[PDB]
């Protein structure tokens, strides 16, 4: 596609420039091009890809909720038509990211840190489709399955303070809470995840302690709201 004539290192360099310029569309397009070079991504490269698409899909989700709320309040075709326009572009970004994960990031991810990262993304962007979905059951089951596979590997392969593991469980609990309508599962996952991390913090450097407690605080913010 578009980035086929640019060097892999130049796409990565240009994705970093884009992040500093807050050009998240450009950042996503460069990281898409980087992935399509067909080489595995480093830890920093996985983070660039995820930050890029998260910033793009974030704008579309904020946009969608504003429009959906006006639409619901109004219950002429314009509101429904524009909500669809935004929803369709949101689905296209989700479909693009899932495309990258299936072709071929996940099947070449052997290490726990890479495979759990990619399966979490897969659950995440099926959850973004779930948010706008009215077939919905299959999308929801696709998110659960990606999340659960990630969780199984994270429990076997990573310590309980692993930030990727902590982020996975944060997101899966939010999946449980507001996608699967299983708030009790959400609360259980968030408590057990929090407490297990707490009992492993003693093992960490100052640097690692900062990293894990920041994500633990997100589990606490949610538990505060849910109970």
């Amino acid at each position: 596609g578009a980035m086929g004539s640019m060097e892999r290192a130049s796409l990565i360099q240009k994705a970093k420039l884009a992040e500093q310029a807050e050009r998240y569309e450009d950042m996503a397009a460069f990281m898409k091009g980087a992935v399509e070079k067909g080489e595995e991504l480093s830890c920093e490269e996985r983070n660039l890809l995820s930050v890029a698409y998260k910033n793009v899909v974030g704008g579309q989700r904020a946009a969608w909720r504003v429009l959906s709320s006006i639409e619901q309040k109004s219950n002429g075709p314009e509101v429904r038509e524009y909500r669809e326009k935004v929803e369709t572009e949101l689905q296209g970004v989700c479909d693009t990211v899932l495309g990258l994960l299936d072709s071929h990031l996940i099947k070449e991810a052997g290490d726990a840190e890479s495979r759990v990262f990619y399966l979490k993304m897969k659950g995440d962007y099926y959850r973004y489709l779930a948010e706008v979905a009215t077939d919905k059951k299959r999308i929801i089951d696709s998110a659960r399955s990606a999340y659960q596979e990630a969780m199984d590997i994270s429990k076997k392969e990573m310590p309980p303070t692993n930030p990727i593991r902590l982020g996975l469980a944060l997101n899966f609990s939010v999946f449980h809470y507001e996608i699967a309508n299983s708030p009790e599962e959400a609360i259980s996952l968030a408590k057990t995840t929090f407490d297990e991390a707490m009992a492993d913090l003693h093992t960490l450097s100052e640097d690692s302690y900062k990293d894990s407690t920041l994500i633990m605080q997100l589990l606490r913010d949610n538990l505060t709201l849910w109970t």
């Binding site: 793009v56 979490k120 997100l218």
Partner: peptide
């Protein structure tokens, strides 16, 4: 909507 905490940029 009340949006719960999920990992990385709350860009929404």
């Amino acid at each position: 909507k009340l949006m719960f905490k999920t990992e990385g940029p709350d860009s929404d």
